[PDB]
Amino acid sequence: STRPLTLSHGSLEHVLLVPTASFFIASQLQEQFNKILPEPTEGFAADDEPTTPAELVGKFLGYVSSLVEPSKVGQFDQVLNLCLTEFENCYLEGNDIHALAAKLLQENDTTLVKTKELIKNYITARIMAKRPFDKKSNSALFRAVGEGNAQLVAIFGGQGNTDDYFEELRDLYQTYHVLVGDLIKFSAETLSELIRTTLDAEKVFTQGLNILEWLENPSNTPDKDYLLSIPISCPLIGVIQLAHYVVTAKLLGFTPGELRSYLKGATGHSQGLVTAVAIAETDSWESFFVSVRKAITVLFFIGVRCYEAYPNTSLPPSILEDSLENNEGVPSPMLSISNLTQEQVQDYVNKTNSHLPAGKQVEISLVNGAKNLVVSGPPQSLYGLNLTLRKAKAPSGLDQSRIPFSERKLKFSNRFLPVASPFHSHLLVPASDLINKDLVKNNVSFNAKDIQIPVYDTFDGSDLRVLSGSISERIVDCIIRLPVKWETTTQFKATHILDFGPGGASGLGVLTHRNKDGTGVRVIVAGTLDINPDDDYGFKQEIFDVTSNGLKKNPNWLEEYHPKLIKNKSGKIFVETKFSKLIGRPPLLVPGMTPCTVSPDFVAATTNAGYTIELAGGGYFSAAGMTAAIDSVVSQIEKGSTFGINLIYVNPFMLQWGIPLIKELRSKGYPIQFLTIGAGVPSLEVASEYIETLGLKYLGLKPGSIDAISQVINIAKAHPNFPIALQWTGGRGGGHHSFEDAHTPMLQMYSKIRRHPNIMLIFGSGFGSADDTYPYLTGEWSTKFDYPPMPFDGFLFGSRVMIAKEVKTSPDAKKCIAACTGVPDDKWEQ
Amino acid sequence: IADEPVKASLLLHVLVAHKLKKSLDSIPMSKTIKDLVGGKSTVQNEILGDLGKEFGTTPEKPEETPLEELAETFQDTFSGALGKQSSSLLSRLISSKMPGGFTITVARKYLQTRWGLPSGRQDGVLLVALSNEPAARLGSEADAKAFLDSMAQKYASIVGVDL
Amino acid sequence: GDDESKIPAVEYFGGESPVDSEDSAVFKATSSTDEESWFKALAGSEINWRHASFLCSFITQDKMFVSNPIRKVFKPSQGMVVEISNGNTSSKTVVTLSEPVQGELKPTVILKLLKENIIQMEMIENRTMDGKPVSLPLLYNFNPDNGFAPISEVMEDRNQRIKEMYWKLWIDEPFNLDFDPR
Numbered sequence A: 001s002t003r004p005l006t007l008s009h010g011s012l013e014h015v016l017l018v019p020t021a022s023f024f025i026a027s028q029l030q031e032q033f034n035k036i037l038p039e040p041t042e043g044f045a046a047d048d049e050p051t052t053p054a055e056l057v058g059k060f061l062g063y064v065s066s067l068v069e070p071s072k073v074g075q076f077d078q079v080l081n082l083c084l085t086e087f088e089n090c091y092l093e094g095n096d097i098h099a100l101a102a103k104l105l106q107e108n109d110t111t112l113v114k115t116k117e118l119i120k121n122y123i124t125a126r127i128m129a130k131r132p133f134d135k136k137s138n139s140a141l142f143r144a145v146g147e148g149n150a151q152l153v154a155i156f157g158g159q160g161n162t163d164d165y166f167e168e169l170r171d172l173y174q175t176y177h178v179l180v181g182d183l184i185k186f187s188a189e190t191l192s193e194l195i196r197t198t199l200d201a202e203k204v205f206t207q208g209l210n211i212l213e214w215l216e217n218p219s220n221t222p223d224k225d226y227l228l229s230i231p232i233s234c235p236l237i238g239v240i241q242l243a244h245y246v247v248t249a250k251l252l253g254f255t256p257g258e259l260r261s262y263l264k265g266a267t268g269h270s271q272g273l274v275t276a277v278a279i280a281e282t283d284s285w286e287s288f289f290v291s292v293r294k295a296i297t298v299l300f301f302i303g304v305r306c307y308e309a310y311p312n313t314s315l316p317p318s319i320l321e322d323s324l325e326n327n328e329g330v331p332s333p334m335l336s337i338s339n340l341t342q343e344q345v346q347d348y349v350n351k352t353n354s355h356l357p358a359g360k361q362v363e364i365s366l367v368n369g370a371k372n373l374v375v376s377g378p379p380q381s382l383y384g385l386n387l388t389l390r391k392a393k394a395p396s397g398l399d400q401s402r403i404p405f406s407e408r409k410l411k412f413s414n415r416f417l418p419v420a421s422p423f424h425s426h427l428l429v430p431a432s433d434l435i436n437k438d439l440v441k442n443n444v445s446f447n448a449k450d451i452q453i454p455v456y457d458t459f460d461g462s463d464l465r466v467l468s469g470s471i472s473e474r475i476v477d478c479i480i481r482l483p484v485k486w487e488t489t490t491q492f493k494a495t496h497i498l499d500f501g502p503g504g505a506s507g508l509g510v511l512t513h514r515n516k517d518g519t520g521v522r523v524i525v526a527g528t529l530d531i532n533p534d535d536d537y538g539f540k541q542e543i544f545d546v547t548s549n550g551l552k553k554n555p556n557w558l559e560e561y562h563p564k565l566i567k568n569k570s571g572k573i574f575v576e577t578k579f580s581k582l583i584g585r586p587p588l589l590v591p592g593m594t595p596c597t598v599s600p601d602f603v604a605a606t607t608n609a610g611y612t613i614e615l616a617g618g619g620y621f622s623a624a625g626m627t628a629a630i631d632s633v634v635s636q637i638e639k640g641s642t643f644g645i646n647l648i649y650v651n652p653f654m655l656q657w658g659i660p661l662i663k664e665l666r667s668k669g670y671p672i673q674f675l676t677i678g679a680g681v682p683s684l685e686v687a688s689e690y691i692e693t694l695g696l697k698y699l700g701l702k703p704g705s706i707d708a709i710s711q712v713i714n715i716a717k718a719h720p721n722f723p724i725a726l727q728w729t730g731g732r733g734g735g736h737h738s739f740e741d742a743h744t745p746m747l748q749m750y751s752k753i754r755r756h757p758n759i760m761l762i763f764g765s766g767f768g769s770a771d772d773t774y775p776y777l778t779g780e781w782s783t784k785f786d787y788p789p790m791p792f793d794g795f796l797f798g799s800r801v802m803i804a805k806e807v808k809t810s811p812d813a814k815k816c817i818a819a820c821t822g823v824p825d826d827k828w829e830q
Numbered sequence B: 001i002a003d004e005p006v007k008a009s010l011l012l013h014v015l016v017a018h019k020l021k022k023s024l025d026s027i028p029m030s031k032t033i034k035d036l037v038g039g040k041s042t043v044q045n046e047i048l049g050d051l052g053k054e055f056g057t058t059p060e061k062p063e064e065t066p067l068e069e070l071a072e073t074f075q076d077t078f079s080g081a082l083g084k085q086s087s088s089l090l091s092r093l094i095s096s097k098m099p100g101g102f103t104i105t106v107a108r109k110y111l112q113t114r115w116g117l118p119s120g121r122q123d124g125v126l127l128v129a130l131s132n133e134p135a136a137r138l139g140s141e142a143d144a145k146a147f148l149d150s151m152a153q154k155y156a157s158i159v160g161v162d163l
Numbered sequence C: 001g002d003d004e005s006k007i008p009a010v011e012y013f014g015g016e017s018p019v020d021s022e023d024s025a026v027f028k029a030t031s032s033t034d035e036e037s038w039f040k041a042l043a044g045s046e047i048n049w050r051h052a053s054f055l056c057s058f059i060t061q062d063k064m065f066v067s068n069p070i071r072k073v074f075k076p077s078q079g080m081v082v083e084i085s086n087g088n089t090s091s092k093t094v095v096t097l098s099e100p101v102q103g104e105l106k107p108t109v110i111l112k113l114l115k116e117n118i119i120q121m122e123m124i125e126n127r128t129m130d131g132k133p134v135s136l137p138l139l140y141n142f143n144p145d146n147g148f149a150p151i152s153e154v155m156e157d158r159n160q161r162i163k164e165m166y167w168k169l170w171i172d173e174p175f176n177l178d179f180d181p182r
Ligand SMILES: Cc1cc2nc3c(=O)[nH]c(=O)nc-3n(C[C@H](O)[C@H](O)[C@H](O)COP(=O)(O)O)c2cc1C
Pocket: A591, A592, A593, A594, A595, A596, A616, A618, A646, A648, A677, A678, A679, A702, A729, A732, A733, A734, A735, A736, A764, A765, A766, A767, A796, A797, A798, A799, A800
């Protein structure tokens, strides 16, 4: 016997069956909620204004929970538990709140701030209704880890990822204050104790370190200069990591030790390495606040002592001005350099170190990627290095498309990181001795017996449990002195990586994603709710989601595009690739060559041999002349044999007689398997005409540059079912060539190509044997450039078949061809 | 006054200027997105998200091309449509700054009536309004009519159409 | 490991677009029958002569490439009833389409292997002069060594075999195409 009560904002509404025993308690709240709720607008696009029924019921749960006192069970408690159970049944169809919040972002006209209100309100209600997360969630990910389909590694980032790291901690306490409220309250009083205990510590912490006060009242928060300083930033970046690890442990209804037992391993970039050894000790909610006491104590005593070893001194304003106008940021002791390989950077830091004395020298302190370094040293010295660098650097605008590749100016980024101390450098070595003596004063040691999971060292990549010496000494040494070799530490095998660390999208996770793309590893950013449009790396929701969306996998190129061998009934062996599968012949094509493949005798000798070849359209001037050529090809080839046609795109007269000729030959069932457009990539509408009207099996396209590749990809998205043959050729190819390298463009675009299963990706230029092609078929060609393997689907041989018996090329031209010694790929731009 | 669809160069300039909390003049069009945002990669990738939602397909490394060479590439496959992003940015602008009794329609009819601007130019003026958000409750209706007047005179000064 | 006997075999290698156990079955077409699913069921799983017959979009007449007539014939419409016998043994498999003919259900088409490399699609007219059904055997070479287009009309005597059918349906005389047109 329940009386319906409608709560509404403008058009959208929600009817709840409030029991008549507590209707007049609910009906007064309905009015008081309708008061605080603003005036409805079209689209509901205003902030503090719900766009969906779900986040209106949410606002009501948040408002009621505010009035409910958790200790004394008053009147509103009974209607909260009913309004919460209505919100669960109607809107949470089994999923977690984070899965719901995600679904609203991609369908409705909600915002990130609005969905963080929804989540806060739901979670606040759930704790004020005496309904803790005691039940183990059926999250697809952790279900899969139990089964053994998924291996999980937890990574923790450090400094340098964001300017305002504290806004991430504010956003945690703003949303999950009913979960982590006890962690922050413990960490604050731990720190406030450590400041009073430690000698001469209050002189560094002038404005204290009570972070509870700073999170309650944002006005009492110190300035951004105090927060960024490493005595504050170190411990509080610890706290933010542990806070994300708590929230993830509670929302899944695990104990810390339960959530840790699911991790195959943990590791940490820089000072994150501390938090990674802390969670590897954790057992249950009782002994968790002992692991945290260790992590907060270590990071604190790093910050306090690394600050005293190398204090950051005010800089001359000319340098600061020069660094801003040149787009290098505010000088710091650590300088990120993107799109330069480590030997290039190590060359530049040797030139810079030649002039400087011992104490003022810069070293490479973090090798995050292949092409993503970080140089530590004094800010004067690093400025010095930055002056040297910006001479080599190419301006932002200039088009080097018409310049040979090796003559081009290197286009790279160099920016000062937002960090106050030079971590992983020879400058902080005096500190090392002090930290070790202060960790034994507070009895903070880590034992290999307590560490349940393998925690990976940053320097060498070895597990820290197998070490002989004290773990705490190695951690401090790895943070302050030894460099980080992030590609060497992350050489673990794992299908999923959780980035707890600060930053989120700009955090350690997405950087590890870039290094590992195409090795079949999926990064989940476990500290940020958002949506990825490309959906290559997940956000927080993917952890908690219970459907199929919770367990996603990223492509493993070596395994997905592995070359295979297959054998027809006759017992003829074929290299099986994406491309050979379609055409049913080896993945080797002789491309359209003017004039080598103009000859109908060569096109037929090649097609009869077993191998696909194009008839060159560039040796014909009329439909009639090409029709007679085509009919000479057909008369000579075997029944069922096909061939293709190369048309030049920059010759519009050829296309005008050529496209209609192919269309009406294909209508009459001429064996024209495919069309290759050379010299350019068509426009979307022209390619849509060629795909739809011509009645071809596939379309070959020869992109010259990156922009051309992107234009092929766009044609492939337009017709996702139609097979495109992207024929990639460098400048080193014979005939009309480009200025481009063979390798560099593929390394960049290979990932974006492989997101389109219709694109059959064919490498050409500078090939004449199995030996020099094999590495491309396999994918090991890209392991010399410090990338994952990148297998190709087929090859083309232009120049190599110019001295065949069946080529019309005159005997003396064949002796001039054979006489050419040629060069290797390093010397072709001469 | 003739109807002209909004230029990708204008729309892109407004999206970048609005996102960075800066005036439409403080952002030079001969500058890369990674240059203007500098440090904050968080700002960079959520700008590239906004350019992905508005125009759809993007050129490679769009944060390493100046906003002119980016806008001219966007302008090819773009045609006057406000799409998803700018639509929902303008919906926020008026519901938070324009007073009650001031919807997009009333502002659209007022720009049509007083100034004589069709839908192609109305969009243009609404975008120039978004870039120089007054960040203030415009309770007084006439105050909000003086706002749209100042922005129609800004739009006129940029595009170069006399009023 | 340098062993040719570990290499997976198939009948014919080719035709597979880059985007992508029952012995005695009985499929029934409807108005809403998903055409591609229909053909995938008729084809089966083993790569053989019937896989080619039902999923190749093209066949070869001499050197030309025409639409697959076996797919056109078997295209699913209300009433159709495809019975497969010996689904597992390819050398004995017989696909037997039946349609409604004078109210009752009769065998219209009988796709099967005749020799090793000949697919015979016997098309059957039931409405004949003397009530006895008339067969038109259309013959296709099945060449697995050409995986792209393994099927091809046997164009020798195709016109005489078509004529011989039409003769039984039109002319009550002995079949003989040797008389002078003049
Ligand atoms: C003699 C010759 C003629 C060519 N003619 C054409 C042509 O008409 N159209 C085209 O797109 N490519 C043409 N190419 C380029 C080839 O299609 C292919 O890109 C190139 O030969 C590969 O490099 P490689 O020949 O060093 O193996 C020609 C190449 C050569 C050597």
